[PDB]
Structures are given as C-alpha cells and as structure tokens.
Scaffold this active site. Structure first.
Site, PDB file in Angstrom:
ATOM      1  CB  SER A 149      -0.863   0.032   1.269  1.00  0.00           C
ATOM      2  OG  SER A 149      -1.495   1.305   1.382  1.00  0.00           O
ATOM      3  CE1 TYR A 192      -3.941  -3.023   4.986  1.00  0.00           C
ATOM      4  CE2 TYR A 192      -3.344  -0.940   3.997  1.00  0.00           C
ATOM      5  CZ  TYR A 192      -3.692  -2.249   3.873  1.00  0.00           C
ATOM      6  OH  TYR A 192      -3.821  -2.862   2.632  1.00  0.00           O
TER       7      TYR A 192
END
EC number: 1.-.-.-
Lengths: 229, 228
Positions: free
Chosen positions: A149, A162
């Site tokens: 990401s 995350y």
C-alpha cells in the site's frame, strides 16, 4: 495487452480469493489459462467463486481453507502437504489476504485490532510463505507477490496498524528477494484505492499488473514494489 | 557540543535500560542533568543500574518493571498511571528495548521466535507508546525516539523478523510524526553495529543526546544513523 494464453500451464495460488481483489485475480488468472488454487476461510464463499470461474472458464479451481488470523505454523505445513498431493509445484503465490483494522489516530487504535492486523498481514503471511516455499522452488521460475500500500512506503496519519504491517510487508519482501536471487521472483503490488466509491478504480481495472507479475514478461524482475495505479 | 547541563529539568524514560545501549543512554542522560526513569523486565538489574547512576551522578533514577514480551495494554496503562503519580510529564521516551531473534534464512526462521520479535519490537512498543502519549504531550516539547536498524530501511538476507520489525518501526514512527506534527518530535535512531573495530555504546551517544536536547526541537519524522 497480454496474449490470452499468458498463463497456460501455470499453477497459481491466490489467498483472500473469496471476495474483492482476490476474487478478481483468481478469475483473471483462470481466464488467462492458469490452474488456480483458491485459499480462504469460508468454504461456502470459496465454492461459490470456484463455481463462477468454472461456468466462466470451463475448468474448476480447487479451494483450501485457511484462517490467517488463527492459523498456526502446523496448519500451514498441513495445507502445503494437501496442495502437494494434488499439484507438483506452485508457479505463483499471490498473498492478497489482509486486515485493514482501525483507521484512526494512534492514541485511539484498539490494541487487539492492532495485534490482529499484524497477525494476518505479517505473521500468518510469513508462516504461509514459509510452508509454500518448497512448492514454489519446484517452478521453472516461481513468483511470490505480496500486497502492499502507499502507506507501506510513506506512513500517514490515522493508518496505524495497517501502515506498520505494510512497511513490514515491504521489508519481508526485500529480505526474501535478497535470499532468492535468481531462484524466485518476489515483489509487492500496491493496488491503491479500489474500494466517493464511483470515482475509484474497479479491481478489474488494476488487473494488468497482477497478470504481468505472474506471466513470463516479468521473468527476471524481483525485489521491487509496483503501483497498480 | 553539547553543554554539560543540556538536559537539566528534562524527565526522560529509557526502556531496555538494564543493559547495552539502554544502560549507556540512561547513564549519559543522567550525566547531562536529566531526571531519568528506567524501564526493564528485571528488578535486580534495574536497581543495579540505578545505584551505579547515583554513584556516578549523585541522583538516583527511579525504575519500573515492564516486560514487553508479555505485557498487556492494561499493564502499560497501569505503568503510565504509576509514572503520572510520581512525575508531571515526560519530556522524552527512548524505546531501546528490542529482541533480535534468529539470523538465518526465511525458510529456517523459527515461527515462535518471529512472533516474539514482532510482539516486543512492534506490538508492545506501540502499546507502551499509546500509554505514555498523554505524559509526553505535557512536555513543552516532548521527544519520542524509536530504535531502528539499517535493515529497517533496506531488507537483507538472513535478517528475517528483525528486519520486518524495524520496517514496521519506521512505519509507526512516520504515522506518529504525521499525527503529532507541531506537537511532538518523533524520530528513529539506527545505532549501527555495536557492543575490536566496532564502536561502543559510549561512542554512539552524541545522537542519543542530541535528540533529547533542545538543539533538535524542529526535527521530526526522520531516521538518523549513529554511525554515518
């Protein structure tokens, strides 16, 4: 882009295959000729995706059950043993399983959710990787792909566990690529924003990269992280 | 560089304070005027470090027990309550506690060791940070420092869980720096190889001092090498 038989005679395992990006990737790989193996926690969800790929493709993927949040190293080895009875190698492993967790300041992050995000995205993804390495080494040119990401490269407010987990995923990918010089292709895909929902890209839209990494056109590319959009 | 009273009236907490770099950082900070608080897993060792710092400095640090290997969020929150009873703020937190784990190929990494490295270096380090944020916000300019490594910036063969954990640490530092811009200084230190052509903890102190003193006030979100 790629020819329609790009992945003929490639056996590719897809985690998180039951929905979202995982589901599109499994379907796309099959469309392009791969023998797909679906991995997920929900057998009824998996059976449904397999049936859809068969209807659409004429060949039915096998599925195997694994819950990354709770699986042990023993569970992963047993899964690898079951795969190996049916299949002679793995040409590809796509790690698309993941947990987002809390999107909120560090002061507000739930510590159990934090632990769960690290367990699925890092620890379980590592134990599963370890179990599957022998099968991948049996490929002519095995390919191992992690999901990253933008916040795995540049940490930003509110992305808490995350972000930490995707940084760890970039590091794990780098260590692996360095260990498996020549022998394996190990890289990350950053799919970006896929799911103002009408403004975002669809999983179908970002598939070309997923195809490229599994086909021969990326044969000697390793240690890198690629942006799908 | 720097003046001998650099850290007078700074209250600074040091984890992993009972050996190696942590013990040296505690001592150095005390030498430079700081009120030091030592955290570690073993009481006998912390007491010995406190006593030595008193002998050498003339002021005795307090110590608190926390085992990052097994602590819960509740344990960290209770620690923070106990510190707040005794101190009005924290001007600095140095996260020095860490586990190295296995140095061997990924195929050979012990999964239990892997999980322990992530639990100490990432999960518990986060949980402890969470508990101590209010105290740090009470400083005029609180400074939060994580320990990183060259393999937290570029993964290399054999560094397994350690590498993954130090990438995670750079990530956690970056998220926090973004959240607390203008409010806290949040940075990493890569101490490099230490402990015969290697440097001692004493040798790498300049950066540890610099990040806690006023000279670094505008510096946040960055990772610094003690051995460039």
């Amino acid at each position: 882009q790629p020819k329609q038989d790009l992945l003929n005679d490639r056996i590719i395992l897809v985690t998180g295959a039951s929905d979202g990006i995982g589901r599109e990737a499994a379907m796309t790989y099959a469309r392009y000729g791969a023998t797909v193996i679906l991995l997920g926690r929900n057998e009824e969800k998996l059976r449904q995706v397999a049936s859809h790929i068969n209807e659409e493709t004429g060949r039915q993927p096998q599925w195997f059950i694994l819950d990354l949040l709770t699986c042990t190293s023993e569970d992963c080895q047993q899964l690898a043993q079951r795969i190996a009875v049916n299949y002679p190698r793995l040409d590809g492993v796509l790690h698309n399983a993941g947990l987002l967790g809390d999107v909120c300041p560090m002061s507000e992050q739930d510590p159990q959710v934090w632990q769960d995000v690290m367990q699925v995205n890092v620890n379980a993804t590592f134990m599963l990787t370890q179990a599957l390495l022998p099968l991948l080494l049996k490929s002519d040119a095995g390919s191992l792909v992690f999901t990253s990401s933008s916040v795995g490269r540049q940490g930003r407010a509110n992305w808490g566990a995350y972000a930490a987990s995707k940084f760890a995923t970039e590091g794990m990918m780098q260590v692996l690529a360095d260990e498996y010089q020549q022998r394996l292709r190990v890289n990350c895909i950053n799919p970006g924003g896929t799911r103002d929902p009408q403004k975002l890209k669809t999983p179908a839209d970002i598939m070309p990269l997923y195809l490229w990494l599994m086909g021969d056109d990326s044969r000697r590319k390793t240690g890198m992280t690629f942006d799908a959009q």
